[PDB]
Design an enzyme around this catalytic site. Structure first.
Site, PDB file in Angstrom:
ATOM      1  N   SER A 106      36.868  49.128  45.470  1.00  0.00           N
ATOM      2  CA  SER A 106      36.621  47.626  45.787  1.00  0.00           C
ATOM      3  C   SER A 106      36.639  46.834  47.140  1.00  0.00           C
ATOM      4  O   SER A 106      35.904  47.499  47.892  1.00  0.00           O
ATOM      5  CB  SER A 106      37.317  46.815  44.665  1.00  0.00           C
ATOM      6  OG  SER A 106      37.271  47.438  43.173  1.00  0.00           O
ATOM      7  N   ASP A 188      28.889  46.876  36.914  1.00  0.00           N
ATOM      8  CA  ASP A 188      30.131  46.185  37.639  1.00  0.00           C
ATOM      9  C   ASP A 188      30.246  44.608  37.072  1.00  0.00           C
ATOM     10  O   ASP A 188      29.393  43.814  37.558  1.00  0.00           O
ATOM     11  CB  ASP A 188      30.008  46.429  39.127  1.00  0.00           C
ATOM     12  CG  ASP A 188      31.195  46.118  39.877  1.00  0.00           C
ATOM     13  OD1 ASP A 188      31.569  46.524  41.091  1.00  0.00           O
ATOM     14  OD2 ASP A 188      31.909  45.180  39.674  1.00  0.00           O
ATOM     15  N   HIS A 225      34.334  48.138  37.237  1.00  0.00           N
ATOM     16  CA  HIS A 225      34.843  48.303  38.668  1.00  0.00           C
ATOM     17  C   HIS A 225      35.828  49.384  38.712  1.00  0.00           C
ATOM     18  O   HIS A 225      36.039  50.010  39.834  1.00  0.00           O
ATOM     19  CB  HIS A 225      35.019  46.981  39.225  1.00  0.00           C
ATOM     20  CG  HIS A 225      36.647  46.582  39.154  1.00  0.00           C
ATOM     21  ND1 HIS A 225      37.029  45.992  38.086  1.00  0.00           N
ATOM     22  CD2 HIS A 225      37.724  46.621  39.877  1.00  0.00           C
ATOM     23  CE1 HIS A 225      38.241  45.740  38.038  1.00  0.00           C
ATOM     24  NE2 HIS A 225      38.829  46.098  39.384  1.00  0.00           N
TER      25      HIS A 225
END
EC number: 3.1.1.3
Length: 318
Positions: A106, A188, A225
């Protein structure tokens, strides 16, 4: 061109930056085949990677190393990048003066690319970047004014339109700087837009190996994610990127038969269960950490690339 010349000054004492770097079963200063793992917002290194790329990179023959910039990656992304630059300098020397891979989760990918854009000394010490769900353009979702008038420093900076993402783009940072693989997902839930499988996507870097999972696995394949980091499909792509002599994942190495969205096969049962529990703790840390009502000021090295954006001190000038 990119920024060149001397590295910007560090704002943190070196001893503090050293304290944030750990390697599993070795010293960063004397380490065989290190990989530097850069966590996402709201986590430490172990919290981001204990259920995934720490054991997985060990089994591929690397020494897993990580930074854990305090508190839980919630401070200014520019200060988080100091930890990564210091770690790269140390791991490069500590592995016999050899380039090392960097692997990110991330916002750790924003940290990495910010460092490559603005700290020229590390470009020759990083052989490749493997970024899972990177937020190079930030995200349009949620946001810094959601449910409270104050939000963590790095939450401000990861918002699309931020002075930080603006400066990264205007300085040339949305083009790959070292060989880069970006694995991300149209579904996501932290980072959007990601759906177009094109440079519009927040994870896309020009000339990088940009792998939107749905472009390989189908429009209906769903990973969030965290699954972007932990899935078996993610493992196959990351293993390709790490092994490739080009520094990027190779399309030959993965395909529709690797489209498994659940945690990587080689994780222990306990690691697989922990890989499914990554959402809540990071979100809660974001809620309990430092918070402010403005985006952190850009450091001088980045100010000229976001002239006109508003940070805590007011309007950015060059």
């Amino acid at each position: 061109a990119l920024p060149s010349g001397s590295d910007p000054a560090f704002s943190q004492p070196k001893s503090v930056l050293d304290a944030g770097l750990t390697c599993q079963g070795a010293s960063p200063s004397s380490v065989s085949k290190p990989i530097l793992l850069v966590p996402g917002t709201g986590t430490t290194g172990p919290q981001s990677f204990d259920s995934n790329w720490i054991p997985l990179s060990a089994q591929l023959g690397y020494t897993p190393c990580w930074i854990s910039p305090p508190p839980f990656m919630l401070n200014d992304t520019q200060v988080n990048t100091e930890y990564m630059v210091n770690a790269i300098t140390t791991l490069y020397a500590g592995s016999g003066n050899n380039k090392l891979p960097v692997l990110t989760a991330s916002q750790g990918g924003l940290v990495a690319q910010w460092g490559l854009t603005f700290f020229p000394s590390i470009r020759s010490k990083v052989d490749r970047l493997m970024a899972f769900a990177p937020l190079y353009k930030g995200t349009v979702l949620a946001g810094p004014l959601d449910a409270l008038a104050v939000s963590a420093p790095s939450v401000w900076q990861q918002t699309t339109g931020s002075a930080l993402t603006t400066a990264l783009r205007n300085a040339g940072g949305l083009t790959q700087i070292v060989p880069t693989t970006n694995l991300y997902s149209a579904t996501d839930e932290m980072c959007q837009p990601q759906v177009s499988n094109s440079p519009l996507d927040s994870s896309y870097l020009f000339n990088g190996k940009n792998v939107q999972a749905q472009a390989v696995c189908g429009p209906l394949f769903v990973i969030d994610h965290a699954g972007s980091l932990t899935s078996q499909f993610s493992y196959v792509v990351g293993r390709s990127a790490l092994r490739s002599t080009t520094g990027q994942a190779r399309s030959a190495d993965y395909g529709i038969t690797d489209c498994n969205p659940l945690p990587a096969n080689d994780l222990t049962p306990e690691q697989k269960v922990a890989a499914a529990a990554l959402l809540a703790p990071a979100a809660a840390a974001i809620v309990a950490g430092p918070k402010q009502n403005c985006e952190p000021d850009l450091m001088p090295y980045a100010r000229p690339f976001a002239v006109g954006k508003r940070t805590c001190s007011g309007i950015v000038t060059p």
